[PDB]
Design a protein around this ligand. Structure first.
Ligand SMILES: OC[C@H]1O[C@@H](O)[C@H](O)[C@@H](O)[C@@H]1O
Length: 778
């Protein structure tokens, strides 16, 4: 390997150039390094993110949400997803993607739950490794993130999470451990603290666990402005990400200075307070990955062009395989015969599709079809398909009546500039619930109305419009923002009053009375940076669905929601199809699933609570979100379905749930120990219905009678998805790795096998387990 010898030839300045990301000269991505031309080491570029390459001013494939990929329960889908991402990044001049994210889904409100995989470590580990191998086999480096315990957005910049060792080793770490062992090029350390030190300054995490124990060969970068000090380079952090940015920086200006790993690091090396060996080691790790990826060849592999058609096909297939049919009463779905030829489509995401979540993972595709249009196509020319908005997101510009001083709507700022924008008062005509709508183009704005903060700008979608409970009278309103370099910032301030919502609802209801079938699209607003304030659909969408389902007895809800959501209207509907955020081909996939051209086969990767405050972290500020910047993961390993099982609570929908348009039968499982002490579980699955479909056979193991440490009531220990023609049977193998039969023994500081007679259950969801065997584990 040449990397150590090349670094040995570098000056201290040349070494320090690798350890802090600078701005992209092209002003598109997250970070750039200049390399060292005299040594044949090229530039390095990194872009977000976990569901496709995000570049300012350059579109790329917007894949379905990470949660949708995980809900396929299919490692081959993750491989395909990764190959598309890697090829797009290579084609678009990048060398790394900043993903995947693989934090556990712990908090139902967690803003970024859409951007990660599961509440279960096995599903997270399998999805992460298959995607990383796909991205890296296409030539692009990955960045497993956010190491570790970044399971919420609330106060992520300052909170410290105290997590016991067994919980870390069994729940949060497995996907990172598997990603390290699969050769992920890099890790990104988390904003939050872990067990008393910032993750990005935690030697136990980044050196002892990650390197001494797991053997990680790559480098660790910080999250954006998460580096805690210059000394962090001696604690396992190799690379500082972030600089101060008023907003956008024009092309041709210098990159703003690094805070801790630039000038300050040079000063600390030259005065002896940081060993030069630490800089050398970090540069060697980076350059070693560049070598492994072929970047140090005198003549490197030529970059590919985009394969837009193949990317569309994979995006479609993932959405078709990860959508979850939650409810389907009396074969309401698939739509067929007259029921499929007279439809009232309702909801804003039927015409402005919900393609990706909000935040750094947001991707704008070249184009995305509208579900209204793909439903119209599929229903056929003879059909009647109507459309009503149902749920307005902007409403109308707030009357000048209600604003003091008046707000100058529209143009705010000339390209480049930042500023305060507005300092004034909003007068509310009547106590009620109002959407307050902010529509920014050409930059970003931040609106503070009373205690509420609203961010608006491209990664936050076309409009930001939270429903706020406001009393009659005045409320403080301040605005500020910034323009991008090419484009002035323009900004509109609107509202949707209670009356305006009722009128839009009534118009939708009328269309539902007229059609045989009502298909209501409903969406949520999960974002990086803050958690959802509650688990309900935002706005007035509950009231909409309830009114439509009261008026039409054939109401189907299509969810474009990133995580769990409450469904108080559930019993009034006949079917609910969860498309997650389904990516650029989501509309095509949605029409195909609705008509049964594809048979739903996704399963949930997380538990949906039955009530706002009944879930694993509810009712305890020291567990969520923390107090005085401190939280403790008091549930331990009993998170997600493990918590519902421990507490004997029935969730709205359980882990592993997902219906099909066909039926399946399963035999009892047969089990044989493998040569490594794992298990090979065999189940014969028959499609006993009339349609081809896929089933996911899930294996759960009960507690060892020989272990006194915490154990889950049942643990997912393997799964295998199978495709069956109508009438067809296949004998399916479910592999159980030896590690799944073990627990983390916080005495021995090591894995220990949980021996003795244990219950093995097989079936098609955590709540539909028909097959069983006693397994004597040894
Ligand atoms: O965009 C750069 C980074 O921004 C941070 O706010 C996010 O936490 C990271 O996931 C992302 O990669």
């Amino acid at each position: 390997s040449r990397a150590a010898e090349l670094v040995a030839q570098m000056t201290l300045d040349e070494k320090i150039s690798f350890v802090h990301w600078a701005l992209d000269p092209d002003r598109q991505n997250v970070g750039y390094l200049p390399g060292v031309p005299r040594l044949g080491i090229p530039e390095l570029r990194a872009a977000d993110g976990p569901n496709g390459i995000r570049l300012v001013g350059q579109t790329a494939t917007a894949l379905p949400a990470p949660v949708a990929l995980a809900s396929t329960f299919d490692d081959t889908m993750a491989d395909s997803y990764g190959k598309v991402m890697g090829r797009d990044g290579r084609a678009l001049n990048q060398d790394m993607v900043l993903g995947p994210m693989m934090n556990n889904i712990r908090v139902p409100h967690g803003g970024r739950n859409y951007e990660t995989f599961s509440e279960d470590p096995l599903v997270s580990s399998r999805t992460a490794v298959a995607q990383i191998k796909g991205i890296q086999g296409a030539g692009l480096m990955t960045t497993a993130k956010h190491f570790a315990a970044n399971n919420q957005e609330n106060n992520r910049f300052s909170v410290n999470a105290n997590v016991d060792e067994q919980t870390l080793r069994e729940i949060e770490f497995p996907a990172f451990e598997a990603s390290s062992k699969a050769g992920a090029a890099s890790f990104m350390c988390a904003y939050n603290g872990l067990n008393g030190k910032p993750s990005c300054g935690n030697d136990e995490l980044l050196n002892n666990v990650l390197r001494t124990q797991w053997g990680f060969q790559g480098w660790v970068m910080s999250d954006w402005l998460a580096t805690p000090g210059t000394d962090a380079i001696t604690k396992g952090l190799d690379q500082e990400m972030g600089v101060e940015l008023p907003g956008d920086v024009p092309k041709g200006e210098p990159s703003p200075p690094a805070k801790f790993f630039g000038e300050a690091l040079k000063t600390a090396v030259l005065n002896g307070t940081v060993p030069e060996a630490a800089v050398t080691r970090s540069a060697e790790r980076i350059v070693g990955q560049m070598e492994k990826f072929g970047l140090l060849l005198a003549t490197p592999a030529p970059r590919p062009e985009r394969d837009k058609a193949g990317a569309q096909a994979v995006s479609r297939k993932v959405a078709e395989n990860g959508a979850v049919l939650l409810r389907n009463e009396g074969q309401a779905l698939p739509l067929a015969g007259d029921a499929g030829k007279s439809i009232a489509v309702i909801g804003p995401t039927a015409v402005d599709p919900k393609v990706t979540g909000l935040g750094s993972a947001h991707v704008v595709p070249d184009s995305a079809a509208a579900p209204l249009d793909t439903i119209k196509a599929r229903a056929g020319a003879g059909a009647t398909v109507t459309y009503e908005t149902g749920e307005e997101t902007f409403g109308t510009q707030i009357p000048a009546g209600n604003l003091s001083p008046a707000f100058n709507q529209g143009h705010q700022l000339e390209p480049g500039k930042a500023g305060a924008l507005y300092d004034g008062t909003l007068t509310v005509p009547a106590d009620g619930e109002y959407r307050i709508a902010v529509r920014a183009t050409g930059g970003y704005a931040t609106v503070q109305l009373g205690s509420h903060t609203i961010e608006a700008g491209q990664v936050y979608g076309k409009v930001s419009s939270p429903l706020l409970k406001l009393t009659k009278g005045t409320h403080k309103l301040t605005i500020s923002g910034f323009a991008m370099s090419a484009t002035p910032l323009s900004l509109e301030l609107g509202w949707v009053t209670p009356a305006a919502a009722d009128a839009t609802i009534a118009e939708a209801v009328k269309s539902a009375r007229k059609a045989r079938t009502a298909v209501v699209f409903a969406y949520d607003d999960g974002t990086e940076g803050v958690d959802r304030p509650n688990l309900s659909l935002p706005g007035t969408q509950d009231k909409l669905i309830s009114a439509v389902a009261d008026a039409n007895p054939n109401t189907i809800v299509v969810l474009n929601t990133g995580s769990s959501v409450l469904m108080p209207w559930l019993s009034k509907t006949r079917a609910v199809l969860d498309m997650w955020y389904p990516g650029q081909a989501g509309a095509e996939a949605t029409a195909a699933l609705l008509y049964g051209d594809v048979n739903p086969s996704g399963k949930l990767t997380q538990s949906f609570p039955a009530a706002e405050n009944q879930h694993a972290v509810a009712g305890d500020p020291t567990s969520y979100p923390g107090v005085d910047n401190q939280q403790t993961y008091r549930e331990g390993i009993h998170v997600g379905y493990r918590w519902f099982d421990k507490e004997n609570v029935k969730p709205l929908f359980p882990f592993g749930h997902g219906l099909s348009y066909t039926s399946f039968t399963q035999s009892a499982p047969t089990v044989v120990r493998t040569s490594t002490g794992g298990l090979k579980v065999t189940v014969t699955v028959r499609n006993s219905g009339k349609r081809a479909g896929q089933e996911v056979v899930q294996a759960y193991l009960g507690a060892s009678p020989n272990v006194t440490a915490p154990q889950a009531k049942k643990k997912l220990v393997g799964y295998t998805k199978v495709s069956l023609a109508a009438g067809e049977a296949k004998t399916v193998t479910v592999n159980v790795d030896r590690r799944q039969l073990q627990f983390w023994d916080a005495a021995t500081d090591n894995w220990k096998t949980g021996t003795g007679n244990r219950l093995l259950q097989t079936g098609s969801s955590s709540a539909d387990l028909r097959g069983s065997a006693t397994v004597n584990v040894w």
